[PDB]
Amino acid sequence: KETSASVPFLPKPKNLAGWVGGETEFDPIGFSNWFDMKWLREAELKHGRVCMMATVGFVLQPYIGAYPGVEMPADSLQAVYAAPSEAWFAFIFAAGYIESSSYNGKITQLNMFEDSDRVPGNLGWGSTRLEGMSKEESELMQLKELKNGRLAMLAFSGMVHHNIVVKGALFPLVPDGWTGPEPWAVGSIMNNXXXXXXXX
Amino acid sequence: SHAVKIYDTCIGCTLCVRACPTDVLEMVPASINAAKQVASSPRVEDCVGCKRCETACPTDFLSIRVYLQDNEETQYSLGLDLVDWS
Amino acid sequence: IFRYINTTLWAKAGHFNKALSKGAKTTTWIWNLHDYAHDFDIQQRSTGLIARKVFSSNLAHLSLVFFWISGMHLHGAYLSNYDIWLKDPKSITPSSHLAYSLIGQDILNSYTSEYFSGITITSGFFQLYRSEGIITQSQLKYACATSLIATLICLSGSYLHMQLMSKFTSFYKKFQSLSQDHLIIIFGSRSTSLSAHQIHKMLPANPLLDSGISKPSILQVISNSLSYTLALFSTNLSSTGKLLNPSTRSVFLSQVAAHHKTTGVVFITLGLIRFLTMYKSQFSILTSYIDYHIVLSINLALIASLSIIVADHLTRTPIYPHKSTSYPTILCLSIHHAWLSGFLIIGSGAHASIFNLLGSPTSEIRHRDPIYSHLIWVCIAIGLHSFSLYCHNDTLEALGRPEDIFHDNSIQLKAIFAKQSFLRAELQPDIEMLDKKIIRITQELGTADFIVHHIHAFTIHVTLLILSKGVLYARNSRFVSDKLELGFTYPCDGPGRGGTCQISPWDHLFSAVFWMYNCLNVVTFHYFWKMQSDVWGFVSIQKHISHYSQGDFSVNSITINGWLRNLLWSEASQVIQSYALSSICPYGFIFLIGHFIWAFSLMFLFSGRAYWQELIESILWSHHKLKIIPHIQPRALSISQGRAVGFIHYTLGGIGSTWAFIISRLLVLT
Amino acid sequence: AKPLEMFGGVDIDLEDTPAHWTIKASPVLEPCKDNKKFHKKLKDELYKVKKNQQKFAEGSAAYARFNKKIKMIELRETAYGDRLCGKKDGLPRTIATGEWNVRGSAMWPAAIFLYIAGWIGWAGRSYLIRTNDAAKEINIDVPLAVTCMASGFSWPVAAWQEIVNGEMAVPNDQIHNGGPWNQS
Amino acid sequence: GWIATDLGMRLPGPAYQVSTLEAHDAMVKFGPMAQILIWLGIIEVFSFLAITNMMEGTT
Ligand code: CLA
Ligand SMILES: CC(=O)O[C@H]1CC(C)(C)C(=C=C/C(C)=C/C=C/C(C)=C/C=C/C=C(C)/C=C/C=C(C)/C=C/[C@@]23O[C@]2(C)C[C@@H](O)CC3(C)C)[C@](C)(O)C1
Ligand SMILES: CC1=C(C/C=C(\C)CCC[C@H](C)CCC[C@H](C)CCCC(C)C)C(=O)c2ccccc2C1=O
Ligand code: SF4
Ligand code: SF4
Ligand code: SF4
């Protein structure tokens, strides 16, 4: 009974053959044993790519944003509201078109891989710059894509929550007079009993 | 008195006969089923109307059907105990 | 031993009954699974498993009650204004119950103290705590901790006894042992233990509070160390109950401690007497009643009777400090125990029927016709007499002939035995009052009290008629001669013999629940109107009394229109006009919801299941049309289940309606 | 000739122009921010809540919670200003004319609910089709159940594609029509 | 941790200038105790998985 390389105190996750993290098989909960892991790979790759683009845009907006005629909020979270509804509508339209056409209308966890079991996360976009590495460094390129995607996902999460704890821009990290985060102003039962809101 | 009729779909279960609380039903020989027997109701004058025979019948729709006739009730069909009508 | 405690049956629903082993072919399977869940008798395996299940389930429920007590204690320690209530109980409404500020629910919390807003609780837990010498938050913390520990202990014991008890287990059948140890060690040796608790912690504390030292020098005096106060410090001679404590408006706690000591002594002496006492006559009862359902019915009837005694004794035999003036608390303590008395009496009747069907009955079932016939006659006699005095008064008052009605100012029906029942209390010829509030004044019983007591007797007798008719005619009847083979609960025996619907003892309980509900709704209304009209209320310094209902009972309760107008309409103004009013918004809403639920029950009560089955089939056609096939086939509720749902919704809605109606009014008036 | 008195109080538009087809042109209604009844009702709300607030201590937590409630009430007053309310009640109205571009319109909630309700129904139907057994309805195949639940998002397209391709409905001659009404 | 806190070792923040006895309540009201509980929760989820997979013999 082998153990996973990543978490050595847990059994090695089966159904996680070599895709990217075959050297550090990491599935403690076991979604790969519960779900079609090809769909899981597709979701992870789409999340990683969307988050790479999201980190780049989130960083860029406060400084080199400002499309001619669009208004500029310093807090990149507020940029959704302080943007033209027309540009946002066209952008969502383009995203939906790309999502629908790429999978030939089989955009569904049941129907995603039912007849066109092409490859997990492959869309034929820019494949001309791949496969010249003799299927050995192409796997390394896929590994780099996955690592950058996961790092970008965690980074975008951190950027969003930093902008929330600061309630301002992003890059003025630890702004003047910030003196630490205590901004979560939502009451809680433990908060109610601790702060003596109830009782007495 | 009620009206208890037996239809051809009977398969000779004998369950209807066993479920009857006043010995209204009986088994007669026949040749329309693999059991070579069908139910009969020779004594429906003693049929109270409990419809246990219909509960016990396993055919798709009951091979035995009890038709209630309230403007027809006799002392036997009413289960009169404190009072005699004879 | 415990290696057989496996989770493999958790996924296998319905394992306990062999009638559910065929699988969930229809939706009736779900309801049957829920219905047979606690029916240990009919479930699979030997009789030893029945004993194990019964005892362990008793322990689990005891743990549940302990968890509820722990929750109440934690609410009192950390979610309550018990501090300011301790300091000034006559100006602060008890409240250990808050509401979150969501969907505007903030409107439910109301001003109870200058530093607290919440829902006024009427459970009387604050008076219990004060009578239990609980002053600091630490005491409530440790009470909650002990109750949680008891919950864990009882849960673990219920878990253990499913395997400690075995096929050879027999300790539950040793009824001599059970009776002796219960009686002595609990009723005697724990009553004296509580007497010790009171003598050593209440009398050191409650007199200190009544002495005006709510300070109690903090812990310098309150934390015991007060052996210079004497046990009978302020008995003031007199007789227990004749003279109340003027400060807290209750019986002195020294007298309560003496009562508990003497009752424990009496119980211990009765346990000693039971070694040689009167027997050989209840012996047929002794041998024929060794069964689960019979002892369950006996205990249910006994506990329900004790509950009604508690309901009548908690109101005008004031034991708790500062509780007689807290009118909503008094009302709740009476009425809740009244309802529990009714429900547990009905359960006793049901389990008497179950015992008759499982075990073998006794001699009284052979002359059942004279019994359940003279019961019928007495029910008819007191129904055509008690109620109709109301109908007679109503008709002759409508006709404009008030001199011909049954009233005090007219033809009067004197309550002869009650008026000569000055034995109870036998207090001095005046009243007692604490602070602008009446503690207790003797209820002057007149004609209206006579008529309403006869109404109570009539309703009790009809409910008893239904229960005893179900019990005695369980095995067989002149109508159906093999009811024993039909089981305990069945819809009918068929449309034959004119119609046999609702002959089962279960259906007799089904009707008896309606009649018990109707019986003690009148009890609730009689109490709620009589106390307001003749006991509760303000005072005048010139010894004049201004009650809440201004003496409406003796002049209006003689006619049904009086009940409709002065009780269900005029006294419902508080609940009906309770929208946007901070404290009483939920009571108005719950009044509306209780009306809705009560009317909703009628759909199940009046209709049969065949119509609903045909409608479900019509809908299932549309479902099958769109390839939506529920393989757990939709079936309408069974006849017995339809009746059960109707009865439950009926009683719940009506109880909620009364609940809101009484509580909102008493909260507004106080 | 004064249609108000002619029809017992109710007034008629008397004008036939397309510009009056909107709900905002109705003479029964009026924008809430300039309606006397709206002002009086929310002022009474503020007054009642404030009067409740003064009953408590100044430094208590109840005082702070009542301040938060007052802020919520004032935010509600300023937020419903653009919503239409009747010229006699002051209670804002919900527009059910399919306007799509008014405050309080019922088109957006209708669209959202219809999408999510079709999603729920489609997920349930997909699970029932893919689990043609009673054992799978009492012991839910949770992986398949959540797979169908996630797959239900494309219901408005998949359902129509099944409708037109003969994969949703079933001919009446394949399901039980109902009770017999004749034979003899 | 108790030794270090009692002897005077502190984090460079004025919010931490409390005694070790009040450290728990002060930091619960400050926030870091909730975050520590979240992190110990994820680590204990992994520990629970370890226990479940060891007691069942999967590992
Ligand atoms: C100590 C009390 C006690 C005990 C141990 C039992 C034990 C038993 N009873 Mg019983 N019973 C009791 C009191 C008790 N009962 C009372 C007081 C009544 C009168 C109402 C009844 C009436 C009664 C009947 C009529 C029947 C039983 C039956 C049974 C047996 C199986 C029960 C079962 O599986 O139900 C499973 C448990 C449930 C279905 C509980 C469902 C919840 C109930 C029905 C609704 C409650 C609504 C709730 C209070 C309000 C909701 C709040 C709202 C705001 C949402 C079992 C031996 C049955 C049997 O066959 O006996 C052999 C049977 O037919 N009992
Ligand atoms: C014609 C055709 O075919 O097209 C081709 C084109 C081409 C080029 C050949 C192709 C490609 C590759 C592409 C497009 C590759 C893009 C890759 C990107 C944008 C990666 C971003 C990672 C961001 C990260 C990790 C962010 C990290 C952020 C971090 C760590 C933030 C860290 C912070 O601490 C810091 C630094 C500050 C604090 O405030 C907190 C935060 C912000 C969190 C394709 C796909 O083949 C297709
Ligand atoms: C309505 C009705 C039905 C049909 C009612 C059924 C089948 C009830 C089951 C419906 C579902 C399963 C109940 C689940 C709860 C409700 C869907 C929601 C209740 C809580 C809401 C307030 C959210 C019967 O089967 C029936 C049988 C015998 C006598 C009378 C009647 C009867 O009156
Ligand atoms: S139960 Fe029905 S099928 Fe069976 S013998 Fe009787 S009539 Fe025939
Ligand atoms: S209705 Fe009853 S009595 Fe009549 S034949 Fe059927 S079972 Fe016998
Ligand atoms: S109506 Fe219902 S309860 Fe009455 S006999 Fe027919 S099936 Fe039985």
mmCIF file with all atom_site columns, N, CA and C in Angstrom, chain A residues 1 3 9-11 26 28-29 182 194, chain E residues 29-30 45-46 49-50 53 57-59:
data_model
loop_
_atom_site.group_PDB
_atom_site.id
_atom_site.type_symbol
_atom_site.label_atom_id
_atom_site.label_alt_id
_atom_site.label_comp_id
_atom_site.label_asym_id
_atom_site.label_entity_id
_atom_site.label_seq_id
_atom_site.pdbx_PDB_ins_code
_atom_site.Cartn_x
_atom_site.Cartn_y
_atom_site.Cartn_z
_atom_site.occupancy
_atom_site.B_iso_or_equiv
_atom_site.pdbx_formal_charge
_atom_site.auth_seq_id
_atom_site.auth_comp_id
_atom_site.auth_asym_id
_atom_site.auth_atom_id
_atom_site.pdbx_PDB_model_num
ATOM 1  N N  . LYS A 1 1   ? 0.826   -1.201 0.000  1.00 0.00 ? 1   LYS A N  1
ATOM 2  C CA . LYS A 1 1   ? 0.000   0.000  0.000  1.00 0.00 ? 1   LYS A CA 1
ATOM 3  C C  . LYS A 1 1   ? 0.863   1.254  0.000  1.00 0.00 ? 1   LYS A C  1
ATOM 4  N N  . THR A 1 3   ? 1.962   5.299  -0.512 1.00 0.00 ? 3   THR A N  1
ATOM 5  C CA . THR A 1 3   ? 1.465   6.570  -0.016 1.00 0.00 ? 3   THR A CA 1
ATOM 6  C C  . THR A 1 3   ? 1.757   7.662  -1.035 1.00 0.00 ? 3   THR A C  1
ATOM 7  N N  . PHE A 1 9   ? 1.453   10.653 4.759  1.00 0.00 ? 9   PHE A N  1
ATOM 8  C CA . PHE A 1 9   ? 0.627   9.955  5.731  1.00 0.00 ? 9   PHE A CA 1
ATOM 9  C C  . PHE A 1 9   ? -0.734  9.565  5.171  1.00 0.00 ? 9   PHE A C  1
ATOM 10 N N  . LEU A 1 10  ? -0.958  9.766  3.875  1.00 0.00 ? 10  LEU A N  1
ATOM 11 C CA . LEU A 1 10  ? -2.208  9.422  3.222  1.00 0.00 ? 10  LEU A CA 1
ATOM 12 C C  . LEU A 1 10  ? -1.952  8.456  2.073  1.00 0.00 ? 10  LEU A C  1
ATOM 13 N N  . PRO A 1 11  ? -2.917  7.592  1.756  1.00 0.00 ? 11  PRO A N  1
ATOM 14 C CA . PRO A 1 11  ? -2.724  6.653  0.645  1.00 0.00 ? 11  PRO A CA 1
ATOM 15 C C  . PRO A 1 11  ? -2.565  7.382  -0.680 1.00 0.00 ? 11  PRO A C  1
ATOM 16 N N  . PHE A 1 26  ? -1.582  14.739 -5.211 1.00 0.00 ? 26  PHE A N  1
ATOM 17 C CA . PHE A 1 26  ? -2.167  15.522 -4.126 1.00 0.00 ? 26  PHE A CA 1
ATOM 18 C C  . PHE A 1 26  ? -3.682  15.534 -4.289 1.00 0.00 ? 26  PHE A C  1
ATOM 19 N N  . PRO A 1 28  ? -6.135  14.744 -1.133 1.00 0.00 ? 28  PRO A N  1
ATOM 20 C CA . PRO A 1 28  ? -6.520  14.187 0.176  1.00 0.00 ? 28  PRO A CA 1
ATOM 21 C C  . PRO A 1 28  ? -7.998  13.854 0.271  1.00 0.00 ? 28  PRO A C  1
ATOM 22 N N  . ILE A 1 29  ? -8.869  14.791 -0.108 1.00 0.00 ? 29  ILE A N  1
ATOM 23 C CA . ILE A 1 29  ? -10.308 14.550 -0.036 1.00 0.00 ? 29  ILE A CA 1
ATOM 24 C C  . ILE A 1 29  ? -10.707 13.413 -0.968 1.00 0.00 ? 29  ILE A C  1
ATOM 25 N N  . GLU A 1 182 ? -8.330  44.741 11.158 1.00 0.00 ? 182 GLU A N  1
ATOM 26 C CA . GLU A 1 182 ? -9.481  44.280 11.924 1.00 0.00 ? 182 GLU A CA 1
ATOM 27 C C  . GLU A 1 182 ? -10.764 44.710 11.217 1.00 0.00 ? 182 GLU A C  1
ATOM 28 N N  . UNK A 1 194 ? -18.591 37.314 23.235 1.00 0.00 ? 194 UNK A N  1
ATOM 29 C CA . UNK A 1 194 ? -17.315 37.899 23.637 1.00 0.00 ? 194 UNK A CA 1
ATOM 30 C C  . UNK A 1 194 ? -17.447 39.395 23.886 1.00 0.00 ? 194 UNK A C  1
ATOM 31 N N  . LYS E 2 29  ? -10.693 38.408 20.763 1.00 0.00 ? 29  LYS E N  1
ATOM 32 C CA . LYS E 2 29  ? -11.343 39.645 20.349 1.00 0.00 ? 29  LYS E CA 1
ATOM 33 C C  . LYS E 2 29  ? -10.547 40.386 19.280 1.00 0.00 ? 29  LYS E C  1
ATOM 34 N N  . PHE E 2 30  ? -9.233  40.166 19.212 1.00 0.00 ? 30  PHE E N  1
ATOM 35 C CA . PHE E 2 30  ? -8.402  40.831 18.215 1.00 0.00 ? 30  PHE E CA 1
ATOM 36 C C  . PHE E 2 30  ? -8.551  40.207 16.834 1.00 0.00 ? 30  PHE E C  1
ATOM 37 N N  . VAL E 2 45  ? -8.092  18.556 9.681  1.00 0.00 ? 45  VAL E N  1
ATOM 38 C CA . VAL E 2 45  ? -8.778  17.811 8.632  1.00 0.00 ? 45  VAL E CA 1
ATOM 39 C C  . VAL E 2 45  ? -7.822  16.806 8.005  1.00 0.00 ? 45  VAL E C  1
ATOM 40 N N  . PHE E 2 46  ? -6.588  17.238 7.737  1.00 0.00 ? 46  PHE E N  1
ATOM 41 C CA . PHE E 2 46  ? -5.593  16.303 7.213  1.00 0.00 ? 46  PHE E CA 1
ATOM 42 C C  . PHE E 2 46  ? -5.264  15.209 8.229  1.00 0.00 ? 46  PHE E C  1
ATOM 43 N N  . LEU E 2 49  ? -8.084  12.729 8.209  1.00 0.00 ? 49  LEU E N  1
ATOM 44 C CA . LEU E 2 49  ? -7.930  11.834 7.068  1.00 0.00 ? 49  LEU E CA 1
ATOM 45 C C  . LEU E 2 49  ? -6.866  10.780 7.347  1.00 0.00 ? 49  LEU E C  1
ATOM 46 N N  . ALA E 2 50  ? -5.760  11.185 7.976  1.00 0.00 ? 50  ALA E N  1
ATOM 47 C CA . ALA E 2 50  ? -4.712  10.232 8.329  1.00 0.00 ? 50  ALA E CA 1
ATOM 48 C C  . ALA E 2 50  ? -5.242  9.155  9.265  1.00 0.00 ? 50  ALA E C  1
ATOM 49 N N  . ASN E 2 53  ? -7.738  6.794  7.379  1.00 0.00 ? 53  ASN E N  1
ATOM 50 C CA . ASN E 2 53  ? -7.069  5.894  6.450  1.00 0.00 ? 53  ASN E CA 1
ATOM 51 C C  . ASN E 2 53  ? -6.101  4.941  7.139  1.00 0.00 ? 53  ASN E C  1
ATOM 52 N N  . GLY E 2 57  ? -6.905  0.716  7.623  1.00 0.00 ? 57  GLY E N  1
ATOM 53 C CA . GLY E 2 57  ? -5.864  -0.060 6.989  1.00 0.00 ? 57  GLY E CA 1
ATOM 54 C C  . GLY E 2 57  ? -5.557  0.318  5.560  1.00 0.00 ? 57  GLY E C  1
ATOM 55 N N  . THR E 2 58  ? -6.161  1.391  5.040  1.00 0.00 ? 58  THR E N  1
ATOM 56 C CA . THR E 2 58  ? -5.864  1.818  3.677  1.00 0.00 ? 58  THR E CA 1
ATOM 57 C C  . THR E 2 58  ? -4.396  2.196  3.522  1.00 0.00 ? 58  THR E C  1
ATOM 58 N N  . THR E 2 59  ? -3.791  2.749  4.565  1.00 0.00 ? 59  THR E N  1
ATOM 59 C CA . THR E 2 59  ? -2.362  3.012  4.619  1.00 0.00 ? 59  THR E CA 1
ATOM 60 C C  . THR E 2 59  ? -1.743  2.170  5.732  1.00 0.00 ? 59  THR E C  1
#
